[PDB]
């Protein structure tokens, strides 16, 4: 919901 890592996303 601001940027993850390689796999998840936030």
Request: aromatic residues 28%; glycine residues 0%; charged residues 15%.
Given at each position: ?10
């Amino acid at each position: 919901x601001x940027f993850x890592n390689k796999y998840v996303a936030l």
